[PDB]
Write a protein that binds this ligand. Sequence first.
Ligand code: HEM
Ligand code: HEM
Ligand code: HEM
Ligand code: HEM
Lengths: 184, 190, 184, 184
Amino acid sequence: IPGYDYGRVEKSPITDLEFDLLKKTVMLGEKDVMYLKKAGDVLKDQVDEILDLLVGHLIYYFSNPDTGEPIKEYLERVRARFGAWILDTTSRDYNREWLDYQYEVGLRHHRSKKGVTDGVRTVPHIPLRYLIAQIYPLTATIKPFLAKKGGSPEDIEGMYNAWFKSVVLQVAIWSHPYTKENDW
Amino acid sequence: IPGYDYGRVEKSPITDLEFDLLKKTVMLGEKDVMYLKKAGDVLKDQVDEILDLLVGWRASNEHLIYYFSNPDTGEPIKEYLERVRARFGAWILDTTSRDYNREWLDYQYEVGLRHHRSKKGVTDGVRTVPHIPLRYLIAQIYPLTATIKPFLAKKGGSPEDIEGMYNAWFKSVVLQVAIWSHPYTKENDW
Amino acid sequence: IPGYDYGRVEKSPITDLEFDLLKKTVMLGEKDVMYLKKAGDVLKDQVDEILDLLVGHLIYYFSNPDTGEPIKEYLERVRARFGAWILDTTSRDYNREWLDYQYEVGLRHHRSKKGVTDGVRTVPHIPLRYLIAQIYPLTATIKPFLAKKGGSPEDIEGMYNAWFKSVVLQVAIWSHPYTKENDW
Amino acid sequence: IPGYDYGRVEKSPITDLEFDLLKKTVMLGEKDVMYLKKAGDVLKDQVDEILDLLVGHLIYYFSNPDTGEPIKEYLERVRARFGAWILDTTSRDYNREWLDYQYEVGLRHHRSKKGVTDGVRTVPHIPLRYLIAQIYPLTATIKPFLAKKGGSPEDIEGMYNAWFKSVVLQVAIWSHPYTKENDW
Ligand code: HEM
Ligand code: HEM
Ligand code: HEM
Ligand code: HEM
């Protein structure tokens, strides 16, 4: 998967303790790690059906800004990495390697690295306000996929809440290159 | 409620269209507005029980008390916790029952400045931790969303009712934090 | 100097803009900052003489209230901090650090923290009316010391007026814990 | 100066006595404190010239590790703090405040906080061996600047040796987060 750089990016300037504190704040515990891995099982085999809901109004950020035309090759390549992110979110251990890639992913929404990974000339920057807003649809979208394979509501809620915790935590990490020095 | 300034704050530097776009991004529709108002009914009469989970000076609040504290001594400011708790109590019902209009937007922006070094501590005249880091505001989206759901369900009803109320609350919390981030983010990055 | 906490106190609940507006109102400009620093030169070597005029209708507030007896220790320790305040007033940059200490000093006249710094059992509270009244003697007392080393009357007036501006500004800050919520 | 945190950092886990013993071992006495302050006079007005020799052999540690490309903003911001360190080394009183900042500076070479201050993704860790080796060039580089303004060789040697003592003492402090528990 071109540009997919999990495990191959530089050290994010967030410390291990600050990360641990962040996981504590979103209440990401051992239970959620289990629920996440279980979401990975439930979602593994529905990724394309998830991808069709999300990536294949914010089309604009996949576009050439001067013409407003979307970049097919940008959408395809990001979609593929997003497909991997679905399973990275569920199945990776949320360790320094994970933190570093989440930070990378945040830089790629940011003017710092947006468009660079796919070599496209695109909207340079995704405003923070939309990254945070997106927490809702990207959280809520997953839940029908978590439930389709049945099980217990407490299973579905545990998986769902763990996913929710991860999305928030990710966006919390991503905000670091968006926020003023000292305000993060 | 001292410091509670809903309807009495200055114009936030966010336009009406950017706000509307933000509500559209979190998918805050007329269904959610209805669900929010219905959460207001379900929650109004459980606020103190909600407040005890989140904010008091005899609450249950966790790794967060520090931001209610004197930084040099680490001691929490009882009067800060009580006054904020009262405003938080009103915020619960403001979140459910207010119309999400310019007046609302302006107060959400105010509330974000009050977590920010710009106005934290000023409202209660306390000498406190000057600034709540953005990372924690965003992280808090989860516990402040998830905490509400048992209270939405206690009075029974339909799961689709509870989910509608719950999701609307979720949308509001995200939208609020999205607004609050504006004084935290670099010029042009919001 | 025990209790002398310049640079080591918490954030006063006064904003940077409200402080700047306050300096604007007392007309504290770049000229006064220069004149203040020059007062610092003129006064540093007369502090003890200054202190003997001021601290070594006030005495009651240095006293045990039940017996009316003054607390030697309290007077000695405050005098020392006052000695430092003379030079802090002239030589510090009037920035957030300064503002925070002025606010601290106001709390120490207030029932909020009077007596705490020196661990004394004393008159709990200095009434605001006397803090404001004291603006005059604490301003006017300094002027002979500003003039003793000679120079130009315009020098002496510039130093004197800057000192006057600072004393007012300080008391203006101190009033915040004395005034009703919303009335400051 | 962004990130420049002298006087604003937490308590280093080195005691006052262990610090005093360290100054005793490098033979940092009252004479050196005087010589240091005199170096401060001699160097204050040559800092940029000094900075151009050192920071604007080990560029890699200012770099992105994956690409080896140096981070201009990292070099700029560190250079500015280094400029302040030159004058902090000469002019500060070597007290607890100073010790705490030296410890901070050592953590910033260490994997514990390297890159965090400037939010850069960089080489995570400066190996201890290079911190110690650097004692020589960072000591010897200063001496022509100490001599340029003339004076006595005994003046230049006193300033030079005091600088030498400080650099060693600093690195001695910095080694604490690098060394095994109990071996420092
Ligand atoms: C309104 C908000 C958002 C918009 C408009 C947006 C759009 C984009 C775009 C254009 C890219 C590719 C950026 C580049 O490298 O040039 C991208 C990458 C990605 N986004 Fe977003 N995004 C948003 C928020 C989010 C959120 C909250 C998540 C949650 C994780 C997310 C997940 C991803 C993933 C997984 C990728 C691919 C990352 C990779 O390269 O591995 N996005 N998104
Ligand atoms: C989604 C996240 C959050 C929500 C929904 C929320 C809600 C609120 C509300 C409603 C208020 C009072 C507003 C008013 O004065 O009218 C408030 C104030 C406050 N909250 Fe938060 N809060 C959040 C995050 C946080 C975090 C992470 C902390 C860290 C402990 C925190 C600590 C405080 C403090 C110290 C105040 C007093 C602020 C001040 O000095 O004015 N809050 N919060
Ligand atoms: C009638 C008016 C005043 C009375 C009775 C008074 C008395 C006192 C007392 C009892 C203290 C010790 C407070 C404590 O317990 O810490 C004190 C501290 C002090 N006062 Fe006043 N004061 C008055 C007005 C002023 C004014 C106008 C100034 C001008 C700046 C001033 C300057 C100071 C200073 C510098 C200190 C030491 C602050 C520190 O702790 O560093 N006072 N005064
Ligand atoms: C081979 C050895 C060294 C290398 C490769 C190196 C490189 C660096 C780097 C990359 C930084 C930025 C660190 C950060 O991310 O915060 C830095 C900061 C700094 N270095 Fe070194 N350094 C070395 C040894 C030394 C020595 C012996 C000194 C003597 C004091 C010194 C003085 C400084 C100073 C003063 C700063 C800025 C401290 C501050 O943030 O205030 N370095 N150096």
